[PDB]
Design a protein around this ligand. Sequence first.
Ligand SMILES: NC(=O)C1=CN([C@@H]2O[C@H](COP(=O)(O)OP(=O)(O)OC[C@H]3O[C@@H](n4cnc5c(N)ncnc54)[C@H](OP(=O)(O)O)[C@@H]3O)[C@@H](O)[C@H]2O)C=CC1
Ligand SMILES: COc1cc(Cc2cnc(N)nc2N)c2c(c1OC)O[C@H](C1CC1)C=C2
Length: 157
Amino acid sequence: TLSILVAHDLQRVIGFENQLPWHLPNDLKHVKKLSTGHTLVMGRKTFESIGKPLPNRRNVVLTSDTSFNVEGVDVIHSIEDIYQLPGHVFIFGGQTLYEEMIDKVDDMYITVIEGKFRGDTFFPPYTFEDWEVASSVEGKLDEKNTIPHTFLHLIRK
Ligand SMILES: NC(=O)C1=CN([C@@H]2O[C@H](COP(=O)(O)OP(=O)(O)OC[C@H]3O[C@@H](n4cnc5c(N)ncnc54)[C@H](OP(=O)(O)O)[C@@H]3O)[C@@H](O)[C@H]2O)C=CC1
Ligand SMILES: COc1cc(Cc2cnc(N)nc2N)c2c(c1OC)O[C@H](C1CC1)C=C2
């Protein structure tokens, strides 16, 4: 499969200043569960945000810098290179990946962060007319996960 994996807020904010706008450990645990043993493709800037490869899956960074060679990352330099990767590939961020990728992906794992944050980066507007809810499961709140949130899984209709 080829999937978006993204958390966005009530106005589709994903990012602020090259970071997530929220602290929400449940969602990062969700990312882990979903992606472990599989492949991430991210934009260069998102890679700079996580700063190192994530363990126990394959990490692929899309970048135009051909001098890019990082330990345990695989570089690619075009959108097209994605479509040849073996297996279940998650588009992992960021704003520009999502824009390039959203009409190409089979499905999307979105966490809707039921808040309104300040962002400088956004997820593309989409329409549920295009997208079928295979599941919708509320996140559980606790002291350390204090923002309401819903795990959507959308298949393209
Ligand atoms: N909420 C969420 O689920 C997530 C949010 N984010 C957020 O997203 C924001 C980052 O978004 P954005 O600024 O768009 O950054 P991106 O992470 O999408 O990276 C952009 C970079 O990726 C490379 N790139 C993208 N497309 C291509 C292409 N087609 N060919 C060659 N290179 C390409 C370029 O690298 P180069 O300049 O080296 O050529 C470009 O500068 C941050 O705010 C971050 O916090 C990130 C992940 C998840
Ligand atoms: C933009 O920054 C991040 C993006 C992301 C990507 C990301 C986060 N949340 C969601 N829902 N989708 C995503 N694609 C993550 C993230 C980020 O900050 C560290 O943290 C952890 C990694 C191990 C450290 C997980 C994710």
